[PDB]
Amino acid sequence: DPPGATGPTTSHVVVSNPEQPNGPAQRLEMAVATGAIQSNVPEAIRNCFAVYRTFAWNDRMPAGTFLGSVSLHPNINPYTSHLSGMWAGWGGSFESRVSISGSGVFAGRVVASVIPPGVDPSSIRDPGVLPHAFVDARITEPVSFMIPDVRNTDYHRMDGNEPTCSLGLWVYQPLINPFSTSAVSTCWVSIETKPGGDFDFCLLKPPGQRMENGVSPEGLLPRRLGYARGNRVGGLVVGLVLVADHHQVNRHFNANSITYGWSTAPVNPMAAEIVVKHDYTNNRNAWLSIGAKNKGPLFPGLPNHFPDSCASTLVGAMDTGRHMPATGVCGPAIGFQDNGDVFENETPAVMFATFNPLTGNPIALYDSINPASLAVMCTKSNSNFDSSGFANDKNVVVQMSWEMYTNSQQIQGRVTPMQGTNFVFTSSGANTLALWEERLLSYDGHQAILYSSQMERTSEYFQNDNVNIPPGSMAVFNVETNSASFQIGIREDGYMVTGGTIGTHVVLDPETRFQYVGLLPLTAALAGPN
Amino acid sequence: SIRDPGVLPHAFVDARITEPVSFMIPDVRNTDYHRMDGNEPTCSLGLWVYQPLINPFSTSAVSTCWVSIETKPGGDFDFCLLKPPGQRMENGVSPEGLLPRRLGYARGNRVGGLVVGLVLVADHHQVNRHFNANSITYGWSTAPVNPMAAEIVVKHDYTNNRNAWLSIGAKNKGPLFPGLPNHFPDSCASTLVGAMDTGRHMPATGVCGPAIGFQDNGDVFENETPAVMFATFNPLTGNPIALYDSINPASLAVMCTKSNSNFDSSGFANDKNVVVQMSWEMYTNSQQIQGRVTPMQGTNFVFTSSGANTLALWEERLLSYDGHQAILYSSQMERTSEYFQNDNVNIPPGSMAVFNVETNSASFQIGIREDGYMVTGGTIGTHVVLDPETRFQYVGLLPLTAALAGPN
Amino acid sequence: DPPGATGPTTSHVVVSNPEQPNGPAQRLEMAVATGAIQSNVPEAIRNCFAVYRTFAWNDRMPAGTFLGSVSLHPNINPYTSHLSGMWAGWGGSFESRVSISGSGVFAGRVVASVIPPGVDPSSIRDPGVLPHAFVDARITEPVSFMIPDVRNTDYHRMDGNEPTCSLGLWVYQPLINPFSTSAVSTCWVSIETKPGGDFDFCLLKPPGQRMENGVSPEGLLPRRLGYARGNRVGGLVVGLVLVADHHQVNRHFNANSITYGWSTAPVNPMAAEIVVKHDYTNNRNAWLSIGAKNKGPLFPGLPNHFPDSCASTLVGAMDTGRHMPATGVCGPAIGFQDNGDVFENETPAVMFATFNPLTGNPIALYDSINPASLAVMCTKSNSNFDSSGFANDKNVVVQMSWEMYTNSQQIQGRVTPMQGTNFVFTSSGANTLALWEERLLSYDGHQAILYSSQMERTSEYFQNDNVNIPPGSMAVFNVETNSASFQIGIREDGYMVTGGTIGTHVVLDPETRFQYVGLLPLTAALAGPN
Amino acid sequence: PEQPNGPAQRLEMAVATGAIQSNVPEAIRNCFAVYRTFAWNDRMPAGTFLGSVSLHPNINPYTSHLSGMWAGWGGSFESRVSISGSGVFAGRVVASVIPPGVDPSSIRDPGVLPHAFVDARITEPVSFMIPDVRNTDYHRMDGNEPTCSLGLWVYQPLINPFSTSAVSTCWVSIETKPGGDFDFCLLKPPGQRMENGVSPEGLLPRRLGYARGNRVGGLVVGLVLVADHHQVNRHFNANSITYGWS
Amino acid sequence: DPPGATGPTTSHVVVSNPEQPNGPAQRLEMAVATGAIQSNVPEAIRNCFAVYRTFAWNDRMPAGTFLGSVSLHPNINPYTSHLSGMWAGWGGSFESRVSISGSGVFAGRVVASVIPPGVDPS
């Protein structure tokens, strides 16, 4: 090869640690444990590299700055991640060439070290203490590193949530430019990846067979954002917020496919029965009591798709204006019989609310959601429900279409709980709980935004399968917007986590792309916004 | 299509056979390899009844035997050319993703109602949200069904003859036809569907839903949300304004269902907007909008089955204004429309993508054309009822002259 | 060779993919099928590289920026492209050396990868997954790549739009200049091409012979713009726009030489006959109903070369000013007799319009173009058409010169349709419908511009031959302007579609050079302006 | 001036199909049979396309008969062209062999191709070889692949020197052999309909007779020429689709 | 072959009459008279059996019930019947395998006899 060009298969292996495991003896261990004597990877994959990451390296990053890591897993090669779906086991080292795109005028060194399993690359504070290699910024040939397979077992389960080795990159000596420019001179560290040598697969399962502890969390987020919808109302996802705590329990599902609420993950309009019809008053509007005849899918008594963004005492108290609760979620109400005979004449605008059943006294808001407390109230101040279509032996289906404030208080992070219910969801440290911004219609010229715990396809994917997110770690995704690229971690609680200050807003266009990285532990610091 | 199976060079297999019998399926090909794109014919292995199955035990019941087929890659089989995994190739994606693995809560492309089953119809005209294998539509709507956002052009007050209504048109902001708003129904009220009656003072048959007025900044008029029928009217009338034959961008309208009410003065002004859903269907006759599609002006799209294969439609489920079941016949379902819309699908113009359909009782075959339309054997008028446990299985590409095992 | 100079034949072949076809065995297969035992290519061409493209590579282009592809075809060597007019088939590989105009101070890499046939190079989302080679910007010796011929068949048809291999170039690590300045430091990637080895031609056709599915799309656009005219009026083409939708049907021809309008592709002046003469009124000027005696060459009744940019209700309402329609394209009218006794005295300034016969009542405007609606008014206030000169048994012909507005609305993307005529033309994704900014003579001191669907030499070229644009593809043209450089794709509908923001204006001087890249599919993303 | 390797294209077919042996009787390879006769008038100017003979089994009546049993073919035919006209007439006809992928009715320079002048005064016929230049290893019997052709054009117009105002017609005949390396590939049952349809030979009868149109069913008189038409009754596509009700 | 499956070309020739003509000597006589020295039949047809008839055989048919005759003609192979539109003469023997769709519980025999020319089988 000429000195400016670099073909495939070309590797200059630098041994960054004189404690490599016996590769072929681990290959013997796999062949004893599974009978995997023959190789399962085509040599077209074993010979050529494939691009995995590229990392920025500025003047303005000091020594010891973590550039990025490459964790050992079959998903860091696209061909190996494709081939892994037919197999129940894997094991073996990878090979990884690093190219640094810096001129011969720069200066600066990168520490590249292989990390033992069970030690987090982002949490290492002293990177030159580990046995490490240096890579100069002036380097021309790409430098290859073996990422060894240090494993307790004879093979890794494809299920297996065990720690593997990583390859970390840190700034050893900062990047400088002799040309005194006030602007930032940027260098690019690209990482490519082979299956190296002793890598093989173990145990034929049929392709796409769901294994024991879940599916891969790659399908939690879309490939690009598009017209994604959140799990509270189904409004359009606008961006992200960083909040301290949150209480969202409707349509929130764990990695164990368990919810704590009463609704199903694809959002539908609320079908419900009419229990007691109420006429309008000089004080308060005409309203209607709601309850299924023990036909709720999760809580029999709570109808499917009742909003937790309804009107309550926790959200906003009633005002002597519109003669109704101030803040809540509204939509039109369609009455229909048991055979589906829709009352087609009127379709009154309607607010979701929880009321105190014990009142009578003018009936006021309740703190929480009780199956005997569910109600819908007219928005029109002096109208009345119709006599035959909204009778006590009828049904109603209501959508969640817009939001009304009648104050300066929205229902952004606010969730109406149930009785005897205290679900709190908190971020620990150097990682913040993140929520999606739904987009409602509003009763004013301002933007109506609710903060939802996850989006609809994340809720359906958690709902329908078990997702292999173990309780110690997160499924981490890269997020590329037009300007900001950052990381999001999804827990096994179903909640989101990313770095930054509580209150940080991100705006996500529908060209926002997500990329599944892998499982990083909860103690890892995610590169957040700003 | 082979009518004489013992004329081909063939093997016999007895019904009394104990060992399984292996056959090589050869690769007779013109080319040096098959493209993974490639829609070229390969060899097949057919099975025909040579001598009929008999039981010496004289039972009136049917004695059934099972012929199971297993498959290796045999010998000289190999793959050729590394593309990256999941790379879309030249003439499309595989049509495996046209239908779901199990039915579930699937929705059709006309209103978005629940898919109940299949019908066999002679012809159909459905052009909204229908996309080809070439990812081309002929209509004006986008494949995920959304509520119709539209402008208010002219507000009309109620009359002793006819209800209060409202004229519709986007300011050249339609995604496909600028002038036709996204998600206007082709199941609207028209002269082709049902003429007006001097009962409800409105068109008889159509699709209705509530109407939400809102401003340009999104300021929703939250007070009233009147029930509303989608209709196309003749703009030239005035004379009491009556139904039109087709859909013209100056003909679009929505009319109150309530017989003597009136649109509000400020929320439904001429500088406002409205968003309406398609929630239920009204008849006011014995004529539904099952296979009926309101066309456009100068538009004649006909979709016909040829022979020994019948055009098939999905049965949507609407809410109804009565105690009967409201069913519209839609050309495809929503995820089929989105999958045709977003990718090119490798269905060549001579063939079909064939699927096995397992319900509780009936298992049959469905062929999807490159037109996006469905095809299966049987008599015109055959109804199938599909529970949400109905499973689909992609078989492959069979030509249009193939006879699909239909229902019954 | 001295280390700074490179002669011909000098190549350092870098292998990017270790799976080349058996070159001399495919050459034997071509000779069995066609009898091409000996070489049909002169050996002066096989020994020397000749230039094909030159790609600009900047600081301001990120990683994964597609620089360009070299698709395998005879038109990528200038000698082989000339020879391919004689031959009906070909087969074999080309050899491609790449030279980068980078100093020794710069840094940056490009990915060179050979792409399998059937895969669009401009649809590859991760460029480095395939087996690739890295070429550095600081390289001195040029690097040679073999572009293999992976093919099902024994040879390629010179017609056949069957896919061949490509050599795509992407930016891997961006180009950086350490001498930091806001100015863009441009690098030049120049690609040269040999016929490599097993390349040959197959079957003699006569030179310049149109083959079965059309001529090449090279002659659609000129080599350089010049004084080019559009097909709406025939005015000077100023530049481009990017419009969402358009309706231009007149003189527009498909790749199958099929038109949907009523005119012929070189714009002649509008030969027309006079049906009913009309005098001037105090409210509106004099006018003249137009209709031939069923002598339109496409729609007999619509006259040859009647404008679509006439005055209509969609264009502009009539004002109580000059007693005529506000916005239209005007011209001087010439009245002549059937044998050639042209009327010499008067020549009225005459605006094109469309009116209503059913009115009777002052006759007003009309929405569309009906063969009874064809009518033109004066520009003067109280003049009148002469008795013998402009009678009911005479003719009239008008040369379109003006463009009047009389409001703030123009006829830019506006086309007047026919009755029973709703044609739309729309792009779908990563690509925007482009149009040609025409030029007329404004009635003001502003610039009077129409947007036309295609130009005359594109309309004439689609007429006289069929053009090899298959229905799933585009014909892509490089646009070498003074400042900008981008791509324009022409469809089989005859419409221009390119990348960029809807509404982007481009100024095209007559030194704008158009250069033909090959055929790309409709789903391909085009590098548009800015 | 390039012919394919005849017996080595035959090795490609025996690999791709298993057709190692011959399937055409050798009495057909020795007998020219009249395929088609073209009328050639005074009233056709220079450059008039007379008709092309595309390479297929249907251009020999013995080979079109044999091809009902076979799903594939490949190989060259041998053709000769003869004129039946008086020795007084003046006019040439170019007959040129056309490479595959070129439309014969789009060729504007027939005398540049490998050609032959077939004058009206000719006595012996002009023999041609029509090669099988193909990308593939065989041809599908139903497949509409590009083949080599044999076009005919009026190079010089046919004129009658005597004072005769009537139209004088000349007759161009084409005879055909299967040449040499021609063979068949894949047994289908005899008369088996292949995938994309039957041949269009059976659209019109061998002679008109008492034929009936599809609007009412009256006796067919002859043709007309109309610009546009709307007939939808009893009109069926090649895809066997009608839009009417009868 | 496995004992339940039968491919093409599989034949167990049972002789019903031990007075066959000299087959290859009659083939030489045909080539003197007509010049048919080489084979006019493709060898794909000579190797495989193709179906001609199917005869129902019941409990309710007594002994001596005529099931059917296979008279020697080109129209008793479907490929040879198609080829015989090209030819004005023929000669030679055909080979006929017979398969009976009987279970192992049934019983019954058929007579197969080759009949001299000039004698009606019925």
Numbering used by the authors:
A (entry chain C), C (entry chain B): 21 to 380, 385 to 554
B (entry chain C): 143 to 380, 385 to 554
D (entry chain A): 38 to 283
E (entry chain B): 21 to 142
From the paper:
The major capsid protein VP1 is solely responsible for most capsid-related functions, such as assembly, host interactions, and immunogenicity. Each VP1 capsid monomer contains two principal domains, shell (S) and protrusion (P) domains, with an N-terminal arm located inside the capsid shell.
Here, we determined the capsid structure of a HuSaV virus-like particle (HuSaV-VLP) at 2.9 Å resolution by single particle cryo-electron microscopy (cryo-EM), and successfully built an atomic model of the capsid. The cryo-EM map clearly shows a T=3 icosahedral symmetry with 90 protrusions, composed of 180 copies of the VP1 protein in total, distributed along the icosahedral 2-fold axes (C/C dimers) and quasi 2-fold axes (A/B dimers) on the surface ([Fig fig1] and S2A). The cryo-EM map allowed atomic modeling of residues 38–554 for subunit A, residues 21–554 for subunit B, and residues 21–554 for subunit C, except for one disordered loop (residues 380–384) for all subunits ([Fig fig2]). In addition, N-terminal regions of residues 21–37 in the B- and C-subunits extend underneath the capsid shell and interact with the neighboring subunits around icosahedral 3-fold axes ([Fig fig3]), although the N-terminal region is disordered in the A-subunit, and no N-terminal network is observed around icosahedral 5-fold axes. Therefore, the N-terminal network around the icosahedral 3-fold axes likely stabilized the hexameric units in the capsid. The P domain is further divided into two subdomains, P1 (233–281 and residues 444–554) and P2 (residues 282–443) subdomains. Unexpectedly, in addition to the residues in the P2 subdomain, the residues in the P1 subdomain are involved in the interaction between the P domains ([Fig fig6]). The βB’-α4 loop (residues 465–469) in the P1 subdomain and the βC”-βD” loop in the P2 subdomain are mainly involved in the interaction between the P domains.
